Design goal:
This is part of a larger assembly, with one copy of chain A (about 400 residues) and six copies of chain B. Chain A folds into two domains: about 190 residues, Alpha-Beta Complex (Toxin ADP-ribosyltransferase, Chain A, domain 1); about 200 residues, Toxin ADP-ribosyltransferase, Chain A, domain 1 (Alpha-Beta Complex). Chain A is built from eleven helices and 15 strands. In chain A, the strands form four sheets. Chain A has a five-stranded mixed beta sheet, with no helix packed on it. Chain A is about 30% helix and about 25% strand. In chain B, the strands form four sheets. In chain B, strands 3, 4, 7 and 8 form a four-stranded antiparallel beta sheet that branches. Classes of the chains: A alpha+beta (about 400), B alpha+beta (about 280). Chains in contact: A-B, A-C, A-D, A-E, B-C, B-E, C-D, E-F, F-G. Bound molecules: calcium ion (12 copies). One calcium ion binds next to helix 1 of chain E. One calcium ion (CA) binds next to loops of chain D. Chain A: It is an enzyme of class 2 (transferase). Chain A: Its EC number is 2.4.2.-. Chain A: Pfam families: ADPrib_exo_Tox.
Chain lengths: ~400, ~280, ~270, ~260, ~270, ~270, ~270
């Protein structure tokens, strides 16, 4: 359908046209940069050179939105889905039952995320002279998503911006021109995220949590405001001491009950992703233990062995940030926990009160559990940092 | 090891144990062949698991079994082991010739043809190449130009629908000019004793295939390149009832190649499967 | 329930089995209090993208955004959107040259009329001229006779203009229609020619991004067997028009196809009003 | 249409190519007040949008009274005749030939770009021959309110029937005897087809492939046509309309004495 | 079984010592398969398609290339080659009783095919002869072309009257003319014969799964290749002929790797 | 050495300036225990992609991975792959009708021949008919008289069949070749006609490397000026055959051209053998 | 050592002070490189293609642009521009026995090209004048086109009969007619003069795979901008004519930074 291909490629302004042209020359760097963008300071975002091109490509994609769920097909490295080994090299023919069992087991119930640019085909993968990895994927796309086809030299491969979270459902073992392949059938689970747009963040926060302040008693409001202003510094520390078992006290206990009541009354109304900048204390580390360094490969691989997948447990409350931008106060910590939150979890918005208590922060109940998905590394200046995509399990 | 779904050695979207032991389509997904599923009125299909379209026709096992190719294709094609094949013929009537007043190009001819179709599927064009024999001689072959092509012909019907005058075939060129000329010996030959016969040789056509955006499209698909492979991996069956005919194909196994892992049927079952 | 869609047409199964209504381009569960308000109550199939064969989908129809020429009667997803065009002729004339062959030329004055709902966009009606048993000729109209954007309920040259002239048996306009000699001695005494249509073609519009409609490539030639095979026809006369519609029907033979069933007493009402 | 709903339903105006609410201190300034339909893109039918027609960034050859998103752009061309000339020769079939002198004329708002009028030639109430317009006789770029052979040139000549120039217009025998003594030939148009121009974001129109022929049904099925005479030049426009039988289409309502100024001005 | 240098989805050692397809995957060759009845194949390991036909080695071994092609063409050596010919009968002429162009001709031809593959749109170019003196060369127009001509089948099926050929122009007009001396000739002493010159067609190729396209492919550029590196073999049964082309190795160069064959084996491999 | 390649035929500099053979599709330096195994030793230019001029690169032409009908003599990178085709005539038969204008019609029996290495795939010559220092007509063969796959050393009607007739001058084969009366009055005495050929055009088949070699769109008609503006010709006769070759050569004037020179005694042996 | 403004991958200092290609890249211009046998070039540093011809400065400087273009088109200040014309001979006329359309004409033409580049198609429009009255204009049909028409040579290579031009219609038919008074006027004393007016033919260039496409390009739209800002220089040594089109600076404007020449220097820069 080169007809629509060319017919869509004149509704653009000069900047968009030249940028889509240049995309055929600097694909991989554009993609990899668009992956890890919002995790900087506010400084370099509005300052970097390849900002005009990201901006114009985003405003090119967002224009054309389809009107019915549509299927796509693309080959995917098996590494992104927590599989750091081999299923078969590029010179074998078939895959063994043992490796298939391992794969089928290790992705039982997870939810993975994707937030980069992407090229995509639409027909079935026949003699396209390109099929690198042994894991085809057969995905579905929901209503009103971006899509923009460039009319390349001979092929017409459309271009999308995957900004959502998928989950694998069904895997089978097919054959193509002699060789073997795995096929997976995945969908898209809806999520609401503000990567950088913090004005809309505040708008949503207020509009959703303002009318909540009147579901409490004035002593509870006063007490929770006490606990939200300064008390945390000491209060939650009591929780670390395993108070209610080892050393009891009813004062801080009633304070705990105040907070827990105040949080339970109103949940979050929709799937929401939050970003909490953690550090070494929470993960069996310090600023001294050799493991805390993440320039060398052996440390990263030992960490991806130990924690990746295993469950995490928290005794105290969780005060999370919404804006995924690196602020000033965390210029020393090197871990950005990235949690997902379902419609039905406790909490509220501390930046819903007029008065300094927190810049776009949300509460999560104490003594909770986290199931971790996938660990990645991103570079900044001289040092790398570990992004840890982990799911909140109810 | 190798649970039911974990093996599917082609892209038919039907697992192997099913496609080998007996299955049924339900809610757009395949399921084991139970026996209590007989009362509701489903049908038990078996097929081949090494091939993508086990009959030859241009639809796969899944599309034919589920019922998602068209809606005018008779319900004798849903079975995977029965090809979806049309058979179109031409019948002549009311020959009329006219002189002009020479010894070459001395009379012009005009015949009245009416098409008809038997079989399962429809055709979306018809351009039958017909030749006019005259007592051991082909007076002329001719292929239907633009005026005589019919479109959307159905199964069990006629092109000029039942109750309308036939079609007139008289012009020989591509752009319709140059009325069919005749000799002078043949003028005297067919005026006195004999008469002309017409017979078809081949028919082109098309078949509507669903696009990637719903709207079916049928320009670029031909029936002339699947006939060479249906006539050679099947067996033909022709029923008659002295009011209309019937034509069907049924796929038979090649008992020589051990790689040909096609299911096999006996006559006492193929006759029942291709009709009911 | 409200969370799955096995057909991919933007209407969940529960609505497609209990009735719904469009309110600001979104499906809404059918309530009893909209009837007075002026709304409607559609039901349709939940296993197909379009449950009437016609080239518009369930949602695209029900929402009422396919086009702004199709009658309102063609929105309830159980009623096909199908045009029916015919050709009525008159004023047939002859012309002699004064040769036992090609002794006279013919000419006919035709006019196309249309009944139904949707409009055709480039019509070329194949018609044959017949005389007392012997098919005199067949002809498919060339570029001089294609009539673009014919509407529902009207005729090609609008009421107030002259009929159309058909005289030419060639893909390019030349080589006027010939005739025998005896056939000239057969229409001077008592008889006269007849003209009957056999088939008609012609595209059909379809919307796009900003409207931006296109009518090149789409064709009514392949949604006709599919509709004539499953639907059921209904006609009505008024002494002034000829109303004509199609209505789909549930095939009870197979225990798999799932689609609602109607009553003739309700089919007539739902078809005309 | 990238204009919000409050503006589109209560009142708005384009300024610096961006929308703005409507105060009441601009009539002395020279603006207007627009209204539209807040569910669809093009609420009038014509192939431009609400924002395009509102701005004025669609073309420069369209009348200033076609911006109001309820008055469509709709070119309406007709054919006028003069100086029939027949020619004898020396049979009963093809006994003379015909030649007409046609001249087009456009009333409406938008232009047309490749006009190919289909005309039929009637005599004594008997259709003689219908005829398209071949390569020679298809003028282009017909502006609003002008003719193809502009004022001051000799009219155009139509004298050939085939799709290539051949087989000059024949005529029977009896018809010659008729039109020589008493009567005369009279032609009339039946339809016209031609393209329209679309801009882009960098000032370059492209009108090879569009068609005014597949929008006319919908512009003429949802509108009221209003005409006017002046003994100088006729005028004709369309104005949209609502049907109070449907609670779906939220198009505003007009009157007669308001439409007459919203359309002609 | 380590590496693959030719990109045909078969490893070298198998492609060189003997392999067999099984469940659409290659497997080494044992000595306990000839009882059940699998075949045994060998090929060349620096080329994708070892014969010259448009298919590859694996596509020909698995049997996933077509269905009406004879089994004897499954092997990677025995190429696929449709040999089509034209026969003529019942030449009738017709005079108009000019000095030139004093009569027209009309022939009744019939096509036939021997060999393996099918041709999908035949268009044989035929030229007339008369006592060693040609008269007219003509390439069949849109009437006389035939399609889906299966192997082993005369074009009009057995039982229908032949194909009448009498026109010359690209669009049928200006029938075949003949001079006067040639007219006066062909009633007294001699008669006309016909012998083809060339045949141009197409061949069906698969796609992703199921659907095939025969519009764009052509046997007109696979004939020089196929015919320059092989050896023909013919066999007459006096009821139906047979013809095949077997591949053989140019021993001059030492780089070209192709298994040789003793004729006593090339025969028992080509036919059966 | 082995560092880089300034061109992109992926054979490095030293290998391309001192000698190289191809083993298992990989280049290799040239020993002297190789000339006993049955190999050869080439040398080419390390600035151009394709060094002789013909439409195949250095590597393809070197490793014999380009076709299978092209002679073994063209594998060397310095000998251009190039067909040279001609037309022979016989048996001109004329037919007189019964006018001082267009008093007869001619018909010739021609046959094609090809010398050189490569094959052509649609031969369409352009022949004119000269008679007694005067030209009658120039015609370019049409659909009937085009050939297919002239292999080097053969004829279009293969040896055994009758020659191919040539009679009609139009693009669609009608309007038989005329002849003026004076030319006939001159010819009947005992004069004769000479048929000369001026040019030929026809595609060349190139592998698409994704299978399914393509030969539609390509043409020799634009590689002839190039191949024949830089090279030098060689002929050979045998009173039973003929042979033609084109070999590149150096521009002794220019220091930008780096393509090794040869000697007649070596070029003859490299070309023919 | 600076940035390329015009973006032809040759920096400004070089493009302004003389430079030279060597091993596929530019180098500064020493004062003894003329001993090797090199050359010195200058070029505008604002426009990509300084001459107006369809090639760029790097191409014309490195020689990678073609292999059949005369050497003197390398100096970037020398446009590449072929001038092709038509010559006539052997005018014959043929009677037929009407007071109109009473005879037919037939001429024997022969093309020829001078200048630098070749043309890969030729379709010369010629009009036959008769005593100051144009008789019939004609554009070369499919039978009278040529291709690969080298610089200097003719269309029918020397030693062949000339080309025959007789037919008027697009498809070959409708031979050129002539009146009866013009006939009686020319056979008595006069003759027919001929003069071409224009020729249009494509030009070859590289592609994105390694081929050289010669279709979809046209010299017909690079003749306006080359023959607008450039001066012609013609020589003729009676063995062959010579035609060249050099550029120059428009001194009036202040923006045009294109070097200026002296006629004695431009002559040697063109012909060498
Ligand atoms: Ca399967
Ligand atoms: Ca299957
Ligand atoms: Ca649904
Ligand atoms: Ca539905
Ligand atoms: Ca809107
Ligand atoms: Ca709007
Ligand atoms: Ca291999
Ligand atoms: Ca191989
Ligand atoms: Ca190199
Ligand atoms: Ca090289
Ligand atoms: Ca520069
Ligand atoms: Ca420059």
């Amino acid at each position: 359908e080169r007809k629509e291909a060319e017919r869509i490629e004149q509704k653009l302004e000069r900047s968009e046209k030249e940028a889509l042209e240049s995309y055929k020359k600097d694909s991989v760097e554009i993609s990899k940069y668009s992956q890890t963008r919002n995790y900087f300071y506010d400084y370099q975002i509005e300052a970097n050179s390849r900002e005009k091109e990201y901006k114009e490509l985003r405003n090119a994609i967002s224009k054309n939105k389809i009107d019915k769920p549509m299927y796509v097909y693309y080959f995917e490295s098996p590494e992104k889905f927590a599989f750091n080994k081999v299923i078969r090299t590029e010179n074998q023919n078939e895959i063994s039952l043992e490796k298939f069992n391992e794969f089928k087991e290790t992705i039982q119930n997870k939810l993975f995320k994707q937030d980069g640019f992407k090229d995509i085909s639409l027909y079935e993968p026949g003699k396209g002279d390109e099929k690198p990895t042994p894991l085809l994927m057969h995905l579905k796309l929901p209503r009103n998503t971006g899509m923009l086809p460039y009319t390349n030299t001979n092929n017409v491969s459309t271009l999308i911006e995957q900004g959502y979270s998928i989950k694998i459902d069904k895997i089978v073992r097919i054959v193509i021109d002699g060789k073997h392949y795995i096929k997976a059938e995945a969908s898209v689970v809806s999520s609401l995220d503000f990567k950088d747009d913090v004005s809309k963040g505040d708008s949503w926060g207020k509009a959703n949590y303002n009318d909540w302040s009147n579901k409490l008693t004035p002593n509870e409001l006063a007490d929770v405001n006490d606990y939200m202003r300064g008390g945390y510094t000491a209060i939650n520390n009591y929780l670390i001491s395993n108070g209610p078992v080892n050393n009891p006290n009813p004062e801080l206990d009633s304070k705990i009950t105040n907070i827990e009541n105040a949080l339970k009354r109103e949940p979050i109304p929709t799937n929401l992703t939050v970003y909490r900048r953690s550090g070494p204390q929470e993960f069996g580390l310090t600023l001294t233990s050799p493991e805390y360094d993440f320039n060398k490969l052996e440390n990263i691989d030992a960490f991806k062995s130990k924690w990746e997948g295993q469950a995490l447990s928290y005794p105290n409350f969780i005060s999370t940030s919404i804006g995924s931008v690196n602020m000033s106060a965390f210029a020393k910590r090197k871990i950005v926990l990235r949690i997902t939150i379902p419609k039905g979890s406790p909490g509220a918005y501390l930046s819903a009160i007029p008065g300094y208590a927190g810049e776009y922060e949300v509460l999560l109940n104490h003594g909770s559990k986290f199931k971790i998905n996938k660990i990645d590394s991103y570079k900044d200046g001289t040092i790398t940092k570990l992004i840890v995509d982990a799911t909140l399990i109810p | 090891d190798w649970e039911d779904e974990d093996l599917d050695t082609d892209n038919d979207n039907i697992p192997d144990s099913y496609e080998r032991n007996g299955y049924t389509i339900k809610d757009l997904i395949a399921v084991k062949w139970e026996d209590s599923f007989a009362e509701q009125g489903y049908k038990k299909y078996v097929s081949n698991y090494l091939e993508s379209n086990t009959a030859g026709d241009p639809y796969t096992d899944y599309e034919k079994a589920s019922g998602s190719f068209d809606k005018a294709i008779k319900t004798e094609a849903r079975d995977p082991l029965v090809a979806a094949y049309p058979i179109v013929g031409v019948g002549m009537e009311k020959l009329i010739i006219s002189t002009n007043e020479n010894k070459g190009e001395s009379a012009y001819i005009n015949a009245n043809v009416r098409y008809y179709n038997t079989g399962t599927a429809p055709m979306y064009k018809v351009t039958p190449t017909t030749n006019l024999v005259l007592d051991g001689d082909t007076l002329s072959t001719i292929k239907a130009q633009e005026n005589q092509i019919g479109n959307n012909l159905s199964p069990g019907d006629t092109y000029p629908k039942k109750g309308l005058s036939p079609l007139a075939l008289n012009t020989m060129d591509q752009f319709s000019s140059r009325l069919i000329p005749i000799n002078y010996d043949q003028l005297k030959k067919l005026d006195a004793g004999k008469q002309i016969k017409l017979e078809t040789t081949q028919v082109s056509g098309n078949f509507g295939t669903k696009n990637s955006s719903g709207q079916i499209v049928t320009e670029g698909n031909s029936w002339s390149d699947y006939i060479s492979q249906i006539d050679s991996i099947s067996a033909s069956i022709i029923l008659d009832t002295e009011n209309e005919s019937y034509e069907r194909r049924v796929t038979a196994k090649n008992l020589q190649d051990p790689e040909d892992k096609t299911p096999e049927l006996t006559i006492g079952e193929a006759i029942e499967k291709a009709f009911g």
